[PDB]
Amino acid sequence: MISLADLQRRIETGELSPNAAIAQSHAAIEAREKEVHAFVRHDKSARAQASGPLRGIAVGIKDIIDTANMPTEMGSEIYRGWQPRSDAPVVMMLKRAGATIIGKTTTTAFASRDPTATLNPHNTGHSPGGASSGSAAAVGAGMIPLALGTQTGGSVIRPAAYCGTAAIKPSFRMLPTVGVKCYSWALDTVGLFGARAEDLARGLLAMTGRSEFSGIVPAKAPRIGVVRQEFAGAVEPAAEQGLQAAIKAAERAGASVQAIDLPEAVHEAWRIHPIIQDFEAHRALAWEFSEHHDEIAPMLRASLDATVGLTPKEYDEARRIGRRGRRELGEVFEGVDVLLTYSAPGTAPAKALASTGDPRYNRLWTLMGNPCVNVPVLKVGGLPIGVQVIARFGNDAHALATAWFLEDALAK
Amino acid sequence: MISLADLQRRIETGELSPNAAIAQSHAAIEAREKEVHAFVRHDKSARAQASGPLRGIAVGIKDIIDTANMPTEMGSEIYRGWQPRSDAPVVMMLKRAGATIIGKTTTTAFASRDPTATLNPHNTGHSPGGASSGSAAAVGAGMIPLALGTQTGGSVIRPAAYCGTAAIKPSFRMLPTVGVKCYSWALDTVGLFGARAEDLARGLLAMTGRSEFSGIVPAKAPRIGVVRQEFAGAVEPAAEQGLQAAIKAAERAGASVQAIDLPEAVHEAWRIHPIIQDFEAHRALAWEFSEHHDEIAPMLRASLDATVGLTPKEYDEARRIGRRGRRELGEVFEGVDVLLTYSAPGTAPAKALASTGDPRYNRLWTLMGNPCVNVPVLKVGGLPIGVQVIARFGNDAHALATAWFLEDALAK
């Protein structure tokens, strides 16, 4: 994988030229696209900008995010050739910082469960996960140092884990979702993919100009609370193997680790995530569902068809439950700095199963809003397994610092 | 003005056909549009639907709200001829209920300060208010029974007041802002314009399907708390004259009225509204400000130019102050059912002043999120003056019921 931080450092000291950096990404993309198919479109003419912390940094954009110079097809035939008039605010944050928008990465239809043609860089016979399939795959295949994605259920953390990349789903609403195709407004959160936690930090610093992302360093002796989300069902062996490997490394590195069972109120918040997501999806995709029903990809079409009956009454109750969940979760952080859990059910599913994987271990956190970071841990049968680092809402900086500490711990 | 509730009843009994009702609206628009200029586009071919609670109901849509069959030009040359692919969810809520989207109403450029060419129905020498200029003017001129607008500062309540129409800015996020050009995501709220409170109730019921809007009837002897928002400075005589008249009519109607102060935390929230608004505006309109700076309307261009320096730091501090204001505002509703305040600084400004009016008496409530309803009270010099009825967050029904009460109390 390509390190954004590495590129920045070399460019800053004149050790590497921005044009060369971009030329390298263009080459890396063409080198494996026929194998991975992570891009909807690759703008071969894209060049490095003259100034800014991200000059020479190529970025892939999940195709539900508006771009003014390239189509934004939403992973759906309904939006074939669709061309937004403007670049989404998050795209502008990148451009204003000097980044190069190198292309649009594949997204499942309307960012839901329908598989794209993208394949896992670690094993082409397996899924790269979803819904931010192309962003995870491209970074995983070493095509680009940074990519934007989004998460409603688990579209940032899960594919990052499957493809072995670092990634972060920042605190809810920190990054604007303006110009980002809506699935569920109560959940949709923009996310970033990169090689390591530090790359994610440098990316957010450039995009937001927030001091909290400047000068971040690996955390020391972090207080970690391990939660296995039992309510989320039975996890696969490989995932537990990764979690144990992470716990052991952290302990050896000086961290204090304790196991804890999440409150019943949090269990409930996890249970109703689908109610909030689907009730809102019917409103957010109302036009598509009413005027182009049969054109909506199968799996999403089915999920919507099964939920046309969700009522405003149960929706409100589901939101009440979410609020109770956030309140009791906050209390949990009184004794620990971060929570550590699974990033996915296990290794990436074989493509033959026609599944981008189950977001059951990701969804709760998207609703809680906390910043989540995937830390690649190990590989089983050649397939990546990661762990998810979660900090208090609004403490994205600490989540990254702890993820960094964890990466170093695993490296010994 | 045309009453949505009235049309609903006559259509329901068969007294009026949906086709005739829609023909009525087209004719009404044609009768005054040449002098009011409330529409960016009047779809003369718009026809009535055959079923649904809103069949036969014509609706005007503020032009920052996406429509798939008509352009959405944002009141800006930058989006001249721009055609969204989909109808915004709120538009779909109307269509699914059987409504007819009769046209796009004028909006100030990007829903800010720059005046449109629309004129006040009561006196064409005056402003119809803004930013939802056309929606207020069209309803005020008796062209249509309903219209959608939005409010970031006071774009729903103020123009309704100026044009003498009923209007409501529902609780924050009750109506989705998907497909609604973003100004400030922390503030933007969709609103409705109608003849009377009952019309708004019926409109929301059909759009949301929430039982809270079903069976609404005038409130009885409500407990009203009068707040003059002293932090926003003294209002013009006309506005105070209308407030005094409302209080008196309410008391004689059996309501208990008491002058109340607002917690300091609430005053502070009003003060920092501009910080949240302008900081987010720079992110929300990044593409426009960076690539089409000189094409942005003069007044908005100047406001943006003057706020480029707002920092993420002061922004976060502003949001913290906002949250505190919301919490403490709730306390105010422990002894009162609704608050009664000004809807605008006074009568509509003369067009010559090149101003849609100061939103100072509206902005606080948009940040707090509470449902607000404008109740026409009287006219000074032939210009309408109204009052603003405000209930607890999530208590939209009560706001409408109390507004209906006030309407009946004024009619004596």
Side-chain angles (χ1 to χ4, degrees):
Chain A
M1 304 185 284
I2 306 176
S3 164
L4 183 161
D6 177 35
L7 296 180
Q8 285 192 311
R9 271 188 287 280
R10 289 196 288 158
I11 290 173
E12 190 67 299
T13 61
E15 175 170 334
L16 173 66
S17 85
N19 293 317
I22 295 303
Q24 282 165 31
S25 294
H26 280 298
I29 292 172
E30 292 303 299
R32 300 190 65 188
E33 255 306 88
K34 299 182 178 182
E35 170 196 1
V36 177
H37 317 106
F39 286 82
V40 170
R41 63 192 59 266
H42 172 195
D43 175 6
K44 289 252 56 181
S45 70
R47 307 183 89 284
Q49 294 200 64
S51 71
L54 295 184
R55 62 183 188 290
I57 305 304
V59 192
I61 308 290
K62 180 175 178 176
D63 211 31
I64 52 162
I65 301 175
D66 289 345
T67 45
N69 67 324
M70 285 177 252
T72 303
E73 308 181 305
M74 322 300 182
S76 170
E77 330 158 305
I78 297 171
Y79 287 79
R80 177 185 175 181
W82 173 244
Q83 181 56 255
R85 168 59 168 154
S86 63
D87 286 307
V90 286
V91 172
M92 288 305 299
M93 298 179 133
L94 293 171
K95 304 208 319 177
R96 288 183 164 190
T100 297
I101 303 302
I102 202 162
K104 308 307 291 291
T105 56
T106 64
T107 176
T108 51
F110 300 113
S112 194
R113 308 300 198 300
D114 293 273
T116 68
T118 307
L119 306 168
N120 196 309
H122 293 270
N123 189 314
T124 286
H126 288 257
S127 162
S132 310
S133 307
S135 292
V139 169
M143 301 179 161
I144 50 184
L146 186 68
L148 291 193
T150 67
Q151 168 161 313
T152 303
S155 296
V156 167
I157 299 301
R158 196 174 74 266
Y162 283 176
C163 293
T165 82
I168 176 175
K169 178 208 68 64
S171 296
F172 183 58
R173 303 187 84 177
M174 186 183 84
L175 294 182
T177 46
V178 175
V180 179
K181 187 63 175 164
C182 184
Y183 186 173
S184 171
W185 61 87
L187 299 165
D188 294 1
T189 306
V190 178
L192 285 62
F193 297 81
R196 302 188 59 186
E198 170 181 39
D199 299 310
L200 301 177
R202 301 306 295 181
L204 288 168
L205 171 61
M207 290 177 75
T208 69
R210 303 177 69 83
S211 65
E212 31 282 292
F213 295 122
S214 181
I216 286 185
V217 64
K220 284 296 189 301
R223 297 173 176 174
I224 305 173
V226 179
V227 295
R228 291 185 162 75
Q229 310 187 65
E230 321 73 13
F231 49 85
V235 73
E236 289 167 36
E240 174 65 6
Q241 287 168 41
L243 184 54
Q244 277 179 45
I247 293 173
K248 185 182 185 302
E251 286 177 350
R252 299 298 182 180
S256 62
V257 184
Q258 61 176 295
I260 56 184
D261 300 303
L262 293 164
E264 172 55 40
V266 171
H267 297 191
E268 276 292 83
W270 172 87
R271 182 179 70 72
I272 59 73
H273 171 287
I275 303 302
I276 298 178
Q277 173 181 61
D278 295 337
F279 180 80
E280 286 187 3
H282 271 288
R283 277 66 256 177
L285 299 172
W287 178 79
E288 289 84 353
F289 189 78
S290 289
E291 317 281 11
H292 299 280
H293 184 270
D294 300 1
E295 289 168 81
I296 301 179
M299 299 179 77
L300 170 58
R301 195 170 75 234
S303 60
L304 288 168
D305 281 345
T307 53
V308 299
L310 292 179
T311 70
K313 180 177 184 297
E314 64 190 308
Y315 164 63
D316 289 336
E317 182 55 59
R319 288 194 296 168
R320 311 183 198 296
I321 293 174
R323 283 177 291 178
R324 288 183 184 60
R326 298 196 189 80
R327 179 153 44 272
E328 285 182 48
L329 173 59
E331 305 171 3
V332 176
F333 286 96
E334 298 190 305
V336 303
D337 304 312
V338 303
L339 298 182
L340 181 65
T341 187
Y342 313 111
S343 292
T347 50
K351 284 290 296 194
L353 295 181
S355 169
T356 61
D358 190 342
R360 64 179 193 274
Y361 294 107
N362 306 295
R363 81 190 208 199
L364 165 64
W365 315 109
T366 308
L367 176 60
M368 296 295 94
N370 305 60
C372 301
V373 181
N374 175 250
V375 177
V377 175
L378 51 74
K379 297 160 62 178
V380 178
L383 286 292
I385 286 292
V387 292
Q388 176 175 25
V389 173
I390 310 165
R392 186 188 295 280
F393 180 81
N395 234 288
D396 304 58
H398 196 185
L400 292 169
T402 302
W404 197 336
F405 153 83
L406 197 172
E407 298 178 334
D408 292 342
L410 288 173
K412 301 292 81 180
Chain B
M1 298 182 269
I2 305 175
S3 163
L4 165 44
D6 170 59
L7 292 178
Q8 265 207 326
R9 279 184 287 270
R10 293 196 290 144
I11 288 178
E12 178 62 12
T13 68
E15 169 175 342
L16 179 67
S17 75
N19 282 348
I22 293 303
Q24 239 89 146
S25 297
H26 283 301
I29 292 172
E30 227 57 283
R32 306 275 267 76
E33 176 59 4
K34 290 181 180 180
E35 60 158 341
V36 175
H37 315 130
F39 287 82
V40 173
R41 305 177 178 301
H42 169 199
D43 179 13
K44 290 183 180 61
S45 69
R47 305 186 84 284
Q49 297 201 63
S51 57
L54 299 183
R55 61 186 186 289
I57 307 303
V59 190
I61 307 292
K62 183 179 176 175
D63 213 29
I64 48 165
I65 304 175
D66 289 349
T67 42
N69 69 318
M70 288 179 257
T72 301
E73 306 180 308
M74 321 302 172
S76 171
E77 56 184 287
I78 296 171
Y79 287 78
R80 183 76 177 72
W82 174 245
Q83 180 54 251
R85 175 67 170 126
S86 61
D87 284 309
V90 296
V91 171
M92 287 305 304
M93 291 178 146
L94 292 165
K95 304 205 311 179
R96 287 179 170 191
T100 293
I101 304 304
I102 203 165
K104 308 305 292 290
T105 50
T106 66
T107 176
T108 53
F110 302 107
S112 189
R113 295 187 306 171
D114 297 276
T116 65
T118 300
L119 306 175
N120 192 310
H122 302 279
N123 187 316
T124 60
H126 291 255
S127 166
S132 309
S133 307
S135 287
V139 173
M143 303 181 175
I144 56 187
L146 187 73
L148 292 195
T150 66
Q151 174 166 308
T152 301
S155 293
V156 168
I157 300 299
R158 193 172 76 266
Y162 286 174
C163 295
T165 87
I168 179 174
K169 166 214 142 298
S171 294
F172 185 62
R173 281 185 278 193
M174 180 180 88
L175 299 179
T177 47
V178 173
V180 179
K181 186 59 172 163
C182 183
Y183 185 173
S184 170
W185 60 87
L187 295 162
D188 293 6
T189 308
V190 179
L192 285 63
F193 295 83
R196 304 192 56 185
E198 171 184 34
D199 302 309
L200 302 182
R202 288 277 113 190
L204 287 174
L205 174 55
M207 286 175 80
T208 69
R210 307 184 70 185
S211 60
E212 53 198 279
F213 299 115
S214 183
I216 285 179
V217 166
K220 300 176 183 178
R223 293 191 166 188
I224 303 171
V226 173
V227 300
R228 287 192 168 72
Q229 307 185 72
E230 305 73 13
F231 42 87
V235 78
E236 283 159 37
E240 173 62 17
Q241 286 160 51
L243 181 56
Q244 279 173 45
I247 293 179
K248 181 181 178 301
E251 287 180 352
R252 198 162 76 178
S256 62
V257 185
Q258 58 177 295
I260 304 177
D261 280 303
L262 293 173
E264 179 61 51
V266 178
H267 294 205
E268 282 307 80
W270 172 89
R271 181 176 68 72
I272 57 73
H273 172 283
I275 301 297
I276 296 177
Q277 177 185 60
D278 298 333
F279 181 81
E280 302 198 337
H282 268 289
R283 249 47 61 192
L285 296 171
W287 178 79
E288 291 88 346
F289 190 74
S290 294
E291 317 275 11
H292 301 277
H293 180 280
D294 297 336
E295 286 166 85
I296 299 176
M299 301 183 189
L300 172 58
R301 194 194 314 157
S303 57
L304 290 176
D305 279 351
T307 52
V308 179
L310 290 176
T311 69
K313 180 174 180 176
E314 59 190 308
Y315 167 64
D316 296 321
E317 187 56 64
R319 292 197 287 81
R320 175 184 299 173
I321 291 176
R323 289 189 288 281
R324 191 147 59 220
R326 294 191 184 77
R327 283 205 304 288
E328 291 188 48
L329 174 58
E331 292 171 49
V332 179
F333 294 86
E334 305 181 320
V336 176
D337 306 304
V338 301
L339 298 179
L340 183 60
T341 191
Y342 305 114
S343 284
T347 48
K351 291 289 295 189
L353 296 182
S355 170
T356 61
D358 189 341
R360 65 178 194 274
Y361 301 98
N362 307 293
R363 82 195 208 196
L364 169 63
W365 316 109
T366 312
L367 178 59
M368 298 295 95
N370 307 61
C372 304
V373 182
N374 178 66
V375 178
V377 183
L378 63 307
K379 299 170 63 173
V380 177
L383 291 300
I385 284 294
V387 295
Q388 177 172 19
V389 177
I390 311 170
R392 288 178 40 59
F393 181 77
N395 252 58
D396 304 54
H398 184 54
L400 291 172
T402 302
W404 195 338
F405 157 80
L406 204 177
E407 298 181 332
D408 292 337
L410 289 173
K412 303 300 178 180

